[PDB]
Amino acid sequence: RGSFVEMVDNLRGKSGQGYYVEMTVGSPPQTLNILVDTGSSNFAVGAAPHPFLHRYYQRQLSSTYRDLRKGVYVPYTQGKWEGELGTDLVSIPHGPNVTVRANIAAITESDKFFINGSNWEGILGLAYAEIARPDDSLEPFFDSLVKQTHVPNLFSLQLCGSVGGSMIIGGIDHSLYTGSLWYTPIRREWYYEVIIVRVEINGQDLKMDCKEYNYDKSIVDSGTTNLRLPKKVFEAAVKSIKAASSTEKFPDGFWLGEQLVCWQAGTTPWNIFPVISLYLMGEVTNQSFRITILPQQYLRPVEDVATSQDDCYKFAISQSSTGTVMGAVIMEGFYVVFDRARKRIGFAVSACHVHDEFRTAAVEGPFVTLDMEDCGYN
Numbered sequence: 001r002g003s004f005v006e007m008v009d010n011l012r013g014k015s016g017q018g019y020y021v022e023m024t025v026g027s028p029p030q031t032l033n034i035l036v037d038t039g040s041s042n043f044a045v046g047a048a049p050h051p052f053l054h055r056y057y058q059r060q061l062s063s064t065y066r067d068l069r070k071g072v073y074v075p076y077t078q079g080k081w082e083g084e085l086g087t088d089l090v091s092i093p094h095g096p097n098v099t100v101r102a103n104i105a106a107i108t109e110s111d112k113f114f115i116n117g118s119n120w121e122g123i124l125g126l127a128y129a130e131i132a133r134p135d136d137s138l139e140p141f142f143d144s145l146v147k148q149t150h151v152p153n154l155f156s157l158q159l160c161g162s163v164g165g166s167m168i169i170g171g172i173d174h175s176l177y178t179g180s181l182w183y184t185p186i187r188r189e190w191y192y193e194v195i196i197v198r199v200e201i202n203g204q205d206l207k208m209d210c211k212e213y214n215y216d217k218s219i220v221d222s223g224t225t226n227l228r229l230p231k232k233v234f235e236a237a238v239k240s241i242k243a244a245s246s247t248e249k250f251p252d253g254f255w256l257g258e259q260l261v262c263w264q265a266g267t268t269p270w271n272i273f274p275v276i277s278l279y280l281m282g283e284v285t286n287q288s289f290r291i292t293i294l295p296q297q298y299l300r301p302v303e304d305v306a307t308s309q310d311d312c313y314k315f316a317i318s319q320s321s322t323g324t325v326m327g328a329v330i331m332e333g334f335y336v337v338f339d340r341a342r343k344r345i346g347f348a349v350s351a352c353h354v355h356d357e358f359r360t361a362a363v364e365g366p367f368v369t370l371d372m373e374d375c376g377y378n
């Protein structure tokens with residue numbers, strides 16, 4: 001408890017391509033880099049030589065492999081993957097010293113799933129069984145891990161933004177944060193669902209029915225880059241961000257993520273952009289707390305741009321039909337504790353978050369907020 005030096009810095013990535021941990025499948029162990037995804041619940045790995053893959057699960061080489069003789073087909077709005085279900089021995093080299101028998105979807109066909117140039121070959125769904133495919137009887141990896149060993153039912157994520165980070169499995173590491181952890185209830189165990197009760201752009205409230213903020217869902221998701229916001233809320237949100245920053249002009253496409261915006265190197269006017277604050281439901285009736293992110297978090301360097309030589313960024317707040325998504329834009333500001341045992345998520349200021357000399361990411365409380373139960377959709 002309190003320090004897990006083995007697990008510090010166990011995450012790698014490329015800006016915009018996600019955070020991956022090293023894992024091993026089968027006996028003898030096959031090493032794979034695996035995307036850490038709190039927005040899904042399947043452990044799914046490449047199992048065939050797709051050209052984009054550095055490597056893939058070779059079931060034939062594993063003595064400990066077992067067929068479940070059952071397929072799984074998983075469509076997304078952007079592409080898909082299809083696989084064959086089995087179980088095998090799984091471990092995490094830079095995690096706890098255990099080996100568990102977990103479900104594995106051996107991916108045999110896919111579209112727009114693997115990324116050309118990426119260095120991961122699978123995905124670790126860390127959310128709950130309810131949203132597992134094909135259904136909730138397929139036990140997620142973390143459930144298997146907790147049932148089969150003495151690892152405490154919790155994990156924490158420090159996403160640092162070559163990006164890096166830590167996934168502390170079974171605990172919390174106090175070197176990864178400063179100040180205090182503040183906790184928000186997990187509303188329901190399917191996604192990591194939470195409730196936003198108030199939004200401030202630059203200290204100024206948006207004065208929307210808070211029900212909208214969570215229409216139809218608000219989730220914490222390490223498998224999404226953006227802060228995604230319901231359309232009605234996104235509309236009001238950028239209306240206010242536009243106004244805060246009208247000191248300089250940008251095409252209406254930029255706010256829609258249809259175009260990048262560039263400045264001369266080291267010339268980004270961060271200060272013309274407002275801090276963003278979400279107030280989250282607290283542990284106590286009528287008590288909330290507030291997390292504050294910087295434009296550093298929502299204006300994202302796009303490095304791979306050959307038509308330019310400047311500092312070009314993407315506005316990483318975007319509209320959504322599935323609810324608020326608190327992606328890497330949010331998580332990079334904070335140490336995030338997925339306290340599954342107590343059905344809550346903790347936020348603290350990350351020791352690694354990107355901050356200039358004038359503004360810093362913040363987690364503050366307590367605040368008095370009435371009628372927070374009304375902010376959740378039914």
Ligand SMILES: Cc1cc(C#N)cnc1C(=O)Nc1ccc(F)c([C@]2(C)Cc3c(ccnc3F)C(N)=N2)c1
Pocket residue numbers: 015016017018019035037038039040076077078113123221222223224225328
């Ligand atoms: C591009 C990327 C950037 C960051 C950063 N920084 C983190 N993750 C990814 C990424 O490539 N995730 C990903 C890829 C394929 C998937 F199939 C999913 C799913 C399973 C499906 C998914 C998700 C989110 C949004 N719509 C989806 F279709 C999600 N959380 N999980 C996520």
